[model samples]
Target: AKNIKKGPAPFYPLEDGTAGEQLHKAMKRYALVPGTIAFTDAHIEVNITYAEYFEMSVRLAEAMKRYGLNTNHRIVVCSENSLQFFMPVLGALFIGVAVAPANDIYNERELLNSMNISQPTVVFVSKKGLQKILNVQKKLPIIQKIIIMDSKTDYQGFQSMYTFVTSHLPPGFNEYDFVPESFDRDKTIALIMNSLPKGVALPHRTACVRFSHARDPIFGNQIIPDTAILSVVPFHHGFGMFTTLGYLICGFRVVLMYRFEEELFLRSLQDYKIQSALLVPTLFSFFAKSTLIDKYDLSNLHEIASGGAPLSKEVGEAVAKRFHLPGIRQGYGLTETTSAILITPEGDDKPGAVGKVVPFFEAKVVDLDTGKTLGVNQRGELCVRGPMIMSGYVNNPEATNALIDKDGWLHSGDIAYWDEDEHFFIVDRLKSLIKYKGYQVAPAELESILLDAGVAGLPDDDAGELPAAVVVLETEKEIVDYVASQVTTAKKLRGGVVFVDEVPKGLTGKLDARKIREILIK
Candidate 1:
């Protein structure tokens, strides 16, 4: 078998170049196309030239430096996906400070836990997330400065820090002046990201592979000039940060959006002639299910990528069928992988598989109990190793040790199997498995079957007014009546099933297993 690797480069070239050099390169190549537009549901529609976007990033970096943020100082940015979200994030990176991309929808308790773990010196919040910050203001006494974006509400005594940072600068405060004179690339941390509870955080020890000056020869040849990317992922997440800044480093124009809207989203594609998009399965399903799809001319859409959650093969085919294009490509990574581990390359994708191992990355499937490697087509825990993987969780050594094994492979906890062709397919999560009579049952499989049945109308889609199954009929009786007739006895739906108004989800749309378990117990 031939070795197949993916990604542009191993190390960023900006290490040897100035911030101006890096920004200029991205602007000239990726963002230079005229009439590029970004949309947000907020009051304002952010429109700018590629040149203007670069300037904004530089200015924000200067503002961060003016505020005295130094290398390794944790700066937390919490907001939905927006133009305002990327500016400070990229700006901080230019100065070598590790920026933590936090979810904007975190509740008070979740916010407190993230704040305590990250201990950010400066926090940047969007208008939507401002209330959560205000509610927990006293709880986070360590936060020295708060910057609000795309908001009009007055933050008492906080002074309008947004305008102060973006407005008229002093004589010596040049945007280009603060670009690091020189530094050690390996020692410098690029980003710090948070994960869901029981999820592992990316380590500070991992260094980003520079786009311009990569160690690998393939990276040098694959750099595309003037590439532009439409960014809808929240900048606070690894996918959002990687696509935005990573593209910027490669000299691509990044179009931002605060939230996904069907009409506006389609318009951006037609208007900008967008070549690529980064989205999750839910959004892709929306596009596939939307009646308005034919209303727009989407000839310019070349690539549609999905991440953050497991994408069903049905949805992927639906997208391809509707658009008259190839099926959607899938990339699999967690916050701990710096958002790039397994990406299905263009023209070399498999429908259900997550694609081959990315360039400079290694992976294996191992038996959970014996720690022995599993052969092809065998289901086991997914393990990974690469430069893009995080160094370790910040201030959490115990959690860190559990994530990266002594041999250096990151234990993903996700169950998967590899085919003879080397393609990988993810099974249900190890923790999500249901045990009945000493056999493992996957809830996701049942959920998928239930959803499919509902879509097919075999089972009532609107039965009992919210489309849920109840277990009050007793375990065996319920299983026999509701599940056994529909599925095999081993695959029978165990535990009671109840339909709620909606399935609880975290900010990024990941199913809250803890919440689901709580709902089940109750």
Candidate 2:
């Protein structure tokens, strides 16, 4: 009889090796398929063999080193998801420089603030974002060099890193010449990610540790070396970074994107035969209600995981029914947890639950005031402890200490509960919990119920337009109209609801409670 042999785990508990080694492994192992597309945009499609990808990375790394990047030096990468974006990131990583991703949508003030915080020596700005940075360039004292991508327009004083690399590098630059024997993994920060609004900030050293461990906990059951992921999330956010770099570390091919073009997204999925994807609830809602959904071939998709916000069960069920695929599985986490704490299994059909705790992590629900652990089915603050937790906030001891207690638990500022089987269910945000008539109410629960009810009454297309419910039952009239005598007064819709074209979102895609309250008061 022949015996089947199992392979050892390939993940490194720490990021201590050469960046080139890690990247080269990724390129050779999973991205080696011939004719496979690595990146796609509105006007460009970059299809390269794994060998060619490695060659390009080597060339870019040499150029970055020649330009004087070192292990602790910071470089700012601000561009839409494209082949050029990945090149700069990999180039910086290979040279041991930490890369900070700044949002392209940020105004001059916001961009300048991020640049000041990072104090990057070099800044990579996309053509579209160059104007905003130039507007504030006089204030960025620490920025020494600016690299422009996607724009042919030349800056008056700054040298274009893009032009220099494409024009000056040798025909076949040796990647081995630039490879370093060792890198300071312990002190070297990989990437700097901004936390969501009103939450504690996280540092890169802490973030990478948590991110590396997240892969096995969330996708351990279904990860395949050849699995292709449809990447639509922005790389500027933590979730997007995890999907891009973390997935690459695990030897998965990531189909990069700049924006969520419906036709382009569907076409990539069909072309690459995507197996899974990471998504936010808003994107899920849009896809579920889109008229073009049925027009695309999505039979290759094996899983759709939603995070960064609560996933509506109605939208999940609608997607499942329409595509004959499994209902959307939800996960819960923040940038502090390296992007996930709980993720539903690939085939699990639970509609509302966010699934069980991820592997190698422990979670408990504790009372906010006393810190007493709550039993199953009781809602409280969710706290977690594990390698997948951030080290602490960068240079903010007060916020860091407040988040990770002395006992080593990272206090997640979220309200949730666990079922008898240990499946986790997020009720409402601790900060966003609403109080009405001296009673505590979860806005998320009400929103989910309203979405379910609204979908039942109208077509999916019109259902999203149903006024966005804020408090569920605000006035006596709405209470009588929506719930009336059918439900108890506590469950009655008294909080109020409004219809807005779009819900307020922060940089990380979480609902902006302050903005929501402002709208409510108005």
Candidate 3:
């Protein structure tokens, strides 16, 4: 008799591979199809086919070879949103180079720390992110090559990515047939996203698991292999990268937006006939209530999937009525787990819930104090175990151990509960962090660069939880500028500094967030 204790059978039986190899499988699947189309300021269009996408990687690999970059070399891609940026992404990975995407809005110190940590041998810069890197370029001597994506600049021995890569393409690329070298998917680590204590490594096992979980009906079955799924989400972050990459691997086309403009976003739906969209709570707010909603004919649009946190049922209801659809589909996840761990299944009646756990995922809600598992709908800390979960925090064994209990479940640190229907709902965030436009704003990260940093928890209509700083020491504007220089935009203190007489402290001398809240409001 056949028996299985964990994960569904059809889904659990996954292809044995790595992130790169499975990507090749997709390249083989959609080799002749148009893979993506990138926009520049909503004016210019840069189209790429699945074959061209692989071709670009081959070319970039040759370019990387010329610069003495190899699989072992860590490469940092810092730029505004660009699908062309993804060329280097796949190219670097195909060649087995380690790819780390830094936020485009990183401040000076943020950029500096990024380099110091990843120890990149190659630097990829864009127009928006150039000045900061250029200012600190002298400090980094190990970066043998500075590849520019946009704008012509005197980067003092820097070369344009287009000019450099095309000129140095390997002799056989797109000529007869170019085959990528076989890689150990389990050993090849892909994507070190942003500045955190730990980096995520995607072995081929991770990607295939993610692919299996999302592609089937288990994880909401949100992504379809249709040609017109739109992606304005940045290639740098998990929300955008994992989503579009997941779709593309199935032979669907994802349209890329370099920068999001309200009018342009709506027009894209009409122009491209975008069927589904992946968005965060903040951007979905625009669709929820903005004059911009009236701009375009969005008949082709069906699924307005939102993540990076929850959206109220009221907003979802409004958008649903407007679109003549069921409601906005919401999902929940973290950088620790690839994109969405839980999602509202297709045709779900419960509009507010974030849906149930997907295939390859097992979850339990537990009492924080007793360490005892709670039954249905009981509020507690949620823990998850799955293959798609990251291998570990980059090189931080202690942090990894702390997150993943001895049994292998990764503690999400989020407060959640599920109903009898298996629909998961986030009652509140137990984690001491703010979510700005789907970006996690860690208070500790901000505190180190400045003083007395913690979640100020300002209510924001546009950007979900606005990252705030309540400080007693230093100037308001001065504090703002200092933080802007040290971290990325998402981590910035957008609520500005709330000058208090002194930060409230508990008996143990720890800053009391609840106390600080009462003091500030008073």
Candidate 4:
């Protein structure tokens, strides 16, 4: 069996230091690298310089210290993608406080599940997030403070984020003395609340390793300073969070969009003369099929990256042809892997291939029945071992044990095969995760909600897959509405519902999901 292992990483972990510590040093170095812009709002009138952004982070870090929050605590940034949203997260990082980025669109139930997992001490919430967090406020005893993300005025006895930062720093504060703290980089959680209810707790070293990949010339195109890249993915997402940190650390100009607006997205690409973009498969599809592409001038856009979900060969080719580029620079990874573990290097235009193993990682294919590693072209479950492998699913040892075996290999649950040249291609997902557009919906989470019905995912071109319900409920419309009222937008039963007399089950009375999926697809 051939185990695919890559060369040494371009960057190494700081000696006895944390991701936060390394980030602080890097930010300070690039604070005045002659770059006029660090991050800016694409549609709005907000542009932050590298020095300005770094100063804001220092102030927020001091504010965290003033508030008596440190490595022992955690914070949640439950807001949309905005200049304000970026500040507190970086601040929390500087102090070794684990920061979780919660989906701002989560309903009361979803928000409650997420909050219960991470148990954040302070919550930085936007106006929309404040309402949902308030709905579940009673159950969360770990929460000590709730700071508003958007508002500057303190209201309802909750201080605003701006107030927190400004008040903590004295007037004429120029330089911050950032003293490094010693901790177990492999154990101390860096980013929390990844992969929904079961938070994938990535340790500080994992974050350091993950961020280092962007600096590699072959992996991230050696991101040049002062060059702008468009960000359409939400900051809460794994891909988005990783990419944002890399961009900020490398001193590149980030043109951030609060949310994807069709005309606005294209206009920003054309107006900003953005050189590159990191997009999901859904957006790639839009770029391939949308009539609006012809109206805009995207000539400056040279590189287009796809992740979060697999990009089909057809859609990939269509976009490349439309843009007159070689091909889409596609990569693959999961929240559990901390981000991309396999990325197509610059100028590697292999169709349908996700690319080769990234630095500091080893990948192998295991035969399904034999449980032994397989050779080239042998398709099976793809397993990986890497520095960036998550510490474990936070507070869920059983799930963690199942994912990462005693041998330390993480079973990706993705059925893939590597070519002779080492390029890997994902064909099917072994795990029952529904990809609604680019968002992943766990079937188990939905099943917990729909104890009344049997739910599974079915294929759809546009959504990748839609949550389909096999309901014993009276009306088909009733089940969809009942779910819609409780779950998030992605979890809704968009695949339509079917009336079934009984859900398939195995002899021991466990749900036979395989049989149920067969029934639904037929």
lDDT of each: 0.62, 0.63, 0.68, 0.78
- What is candidate 1's lDDT per residue for 112-145, written digit by digit as tens? 7777777778888876787787788688777887
Which runs in model 2 stand beyond 4 Å of their true positions?
1-20, 28-36, 42-49, 151-158, 166-172, 176-181, 196-226, 289-291, 347-349, 452-480, 483-487, 495-499, 507-509
| TM-score of each candidate structure, all chains considered together | 0.82, 0.83, 0.77, 0.81
Q: Over 4 Å off in model 3, which ranges?
A: 1-13, 33-46, 65-67, 138-141, 151-156, 195-197, 217-226, 289-295, 432-522
Residue pairs with backbone atoms closer than 3 Å in model 4 (clashes):
none
User: Which is superior by TM-score, 1 or 4?
Assistant: 1
Instruction: State which candidate has the highest lDDT.
Output: 4
Expressed as tens digits, the lDDT of each residue in 334-380 for candidate 3 is 77777677867666658678776767777778888997888776878
Q: State how far residue 383 of model 3 sits from its true place (Å).
A: 0.9
Worst 10 residues of 3 by lDDT: 1-10
Better of 1 and 2 by TM-score: 2
- The positional error of residue 254 in candidate 3, measured at the CA in angstroms, is 1.7
Candidate 2 Cα lDDT to native: 0.63
Report the alpha-carbon TM-score of model 2 versus the true structure: 0.83
